[PDB]
């Protein structure tokens, strides 16, 4: 996908799955020619750290944080995918968007 | 806001003799106004293996 999309409710826990992402390779499955490694290479907002990407299983989790609509609602991430033993080229490669929104719940009673 | 380093749980000298941590300062607009300082946390030893007969 160009734009992967995700969301959760308020105070969804720390170190908890938010969403997953995927890429495909044209070399034979279950080999070094096709093992897919995943990283984040831009965040918005870039402080504090809010999430994590697993290199092998391609999942995105929150970090030690609970997220609230009422504190901040909308995040954007730029990811990259490459294969082989982790020797980066000098040539440019494609990257992907991930967008993640914190949903409002009625946690707050009207005063 | 202060740079106080902490360790988070106990650790065994048995298997760990040093970790290789790096400290870097940043602003809230992403600007980097200090060079990274690598610091080696050395682990230190106490008599905690028993002696055992052969």
Swiss-Prot record, chain A:
Regarding how it is modified after translation, the entry says: Palmitoylated by ZDHHC5 at the plasma membrane.
Subcellular location as annotated = Cell membrane; Cell junction, Desmosome; Cytoplasm
Domain of life from the UniProt record? Eukaryota
Instruction: Summarize the subunit comment.
Output: Interacts with PKP2. Interacts with CTNNB1; the interaction promotes localization of CTNNB1 at cell junctions thus reducing its nuclear localization and subsequent transcription of CTNNB1/TCF-target genes.
User: Anything noted about its domains?
Assistant: Three calcium ions are usually bound at the interface of each cadherin domain and rigidify the connections, imparting a strong curvature to the full-length ectodomain.
Q: Main role?
A: A component of desmosome cell-cell junctions which are required for positive regulation of cellular adhesion. Involved in the interaction of plaque proteins and intermediate filaments mediating cell-cell adhesion. Required for proliferation and viability of embryonic stem cells in the blastocyst, thereby crucial for progression of post-implantation embryonic development.
**The name this protein goes by in its record:** Desmoglein-2
Organism placement in taxonomy: Eukaryota, Metazoa, Chordata, Craniata, Vertebrata
Swiss-Prot record, chain B:
- Which domain of life does the UniProt lineage start with? Eukaryota
What is the tissue localization of expression for this protein? Expressed at intercalated disks in the heart, where it is colocalized with CDH2 (at protein level). Expressed in intestinal mucosal cells (at protein level).
Q: What drives induction of this protein's expression?
A: Induced in the hours following cyclic mechanical strain in keratinocytes.
The entry's stated outcome for residue 13 to C is: In ARVD11; fails to undergo complete processing into a mature form; fails to localize at the desmosomes
Q: Where in the cell is it found?
A: Cell membrane; Cell junction, Desmosome
Describe the function of this protein.
A component of desmosome cell-cell junctions which are required for positive regulation of cellular adhesion. Promotes timely incorporation of DSG2 into desmosome intercellular junctions and promotes interaction of desmosome cell junctions with intermediate filament cytokeratin, via modulation of DSP phosphorylation. Plays an important role in desmosome-mediated maintenance of intestinal epithelial cell intercellular adhesion strength and barrier function.
Q: How does it assemble?
A: Interacts with DSP, PKP2 and JUP. Interacts with DSG3; the interaction may limit the interaction of DSC3 with p38MAPK family members and therefore repress p38MAPK signaling activation.
Remarks, miscellaneous = Expression is decreased in the intestinal mucosa of ulcerative colitis patients, potential adversely effecting wound healing of the intestinal mucosa.
Disease connection: Arrhythmogenic right ventricular dysplasia, familial, 11: A congenital heart disease characterized by infiltration of adipose and fibrous tissue into the right ventricle and loss of myocardial cells, resulting in ventricular and supraventricular arrhythmias.
Quote the record's domain comment: Calcium may be bound by the cadherin-like repeats.
User: What name is this protein filed under?
Assistant: Desmocollin-2
In which organism is this protein found? Homo sapiens
